Amino acid sequence: IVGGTASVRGEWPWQVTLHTTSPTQRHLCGGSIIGNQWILTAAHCFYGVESPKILRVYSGILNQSEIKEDTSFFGVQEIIIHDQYKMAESGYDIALLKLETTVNYTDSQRPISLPSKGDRNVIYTDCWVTGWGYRKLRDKIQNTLQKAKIPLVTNEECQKRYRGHKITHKMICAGYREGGKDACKGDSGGPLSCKHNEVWHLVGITSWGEGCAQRERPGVYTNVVEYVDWILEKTQ
Ligand SMILES: Cn1nccc1-c1cnn([C@H](CC2CC2)c2ccc(-c3c(-n4cnnn4)ccc(Cl)c3F)c[n+]2[O-])c1
Numbered sequence: 001i002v003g004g005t006a007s008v009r010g011e012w013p014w015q016v017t018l019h020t021t022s023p024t025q026r027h028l029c030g031g032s033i034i035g036n037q038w039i040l041t042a043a044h045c046f047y048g049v050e051s052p053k054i055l056r057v058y059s060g061i062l063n064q065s066e067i068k069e070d071t072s073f074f075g076v077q078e079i080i081i082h083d084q085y086k087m088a089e090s091g092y093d094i095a096l097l098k099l100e101t102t103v104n105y106t107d108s109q110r111p112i113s114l115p116s117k118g119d120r121n122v123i124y125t126d127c128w129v130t131g132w133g134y135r136k137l138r139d140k141i142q143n144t145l146q147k148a149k150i151p152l153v154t155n156e157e158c159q160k161r162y163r164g165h166k167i168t169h170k171m172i173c174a175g176y177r178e179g180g181k182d183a184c185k186g187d188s189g190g191p192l193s194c195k196h197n198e199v200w201h202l203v204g205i206t207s208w209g210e211g212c213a214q215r216e217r218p219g220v221y222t223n224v225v226e227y228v229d230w231i232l233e234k235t236q
Helices: 155-161 224-235
Strands: 015-020 026-035 038-041 055-059 076-081 095-099 127-131 146-149 171-174 191-196 199-208 219-223
Touching (some): 015 038, 026 055, 026 224, 038 199, 038 224, 095 224, 199 224
Antiparallel strands (some): 015 055, 026 038, 076 095, 127 146, 127 191, 171 219, 191 199
16 A cells, blocks of 8 residues: 555454465455455456465454464365456456355454445445555565555546556546555455445455556556446355
């Protein structure tokens, strides 16, 4: 996260850190708890992942340094990538992780609701991007989970900033005109979380952008509301 600030414990309890363990253990991507056995993340995260065997899902984590050899984690039973996914910039950047067991929800590990049926025309004005990613394009995975408040941009404006790409209704963009706050390397797969009527909804999945926090180059997110039917079909 560029231009963000440190979170505190329990602040974003649906945020998980997905680790790979091949050839070494490291944070790979963010993700969001959406059910007791289900993480929603980005399909692009699994480029070069040979199988679910090497993945570990950690929940209730504030600092990456909390993770040691005896830290509990969830195994991944299945990676479900959208059947139309080819590359992040062309959309369908969405994946479900089915965990090997059920999360028991606690103050530190909580689900986030999907965008609600009937809220199709809600204007979200309180949206936050979170993660352990870089604070600038040439950096390092951060220890403490970072947060940044970022305004949604219309798809029309977003297309004007990305005239080499097809910005579709299945994407949502977010960013300041002058830049300064954005996701960056290591944040993808995590949530764009928006609060409406004091309830958090998973509005976006952090996906891609041209650089990090550049002026007139918003971050691009998978528009979760357009995949609710797909999510429900897979989780049922
Ligand atoms: C894990 N790891 N450890 C070390 C390095 C990394 C690493 C490297 N790239 N990535 C991912 C993709 C990769 C996981 C398949 C990635 C790709 C793009 C973005 C991104 C950007 N950026 C544009 N230029 N940089 N960022 C801007 C906006 C928005 Cl909205 C974004 F999503 C974020 N991430 O995370 C993780």
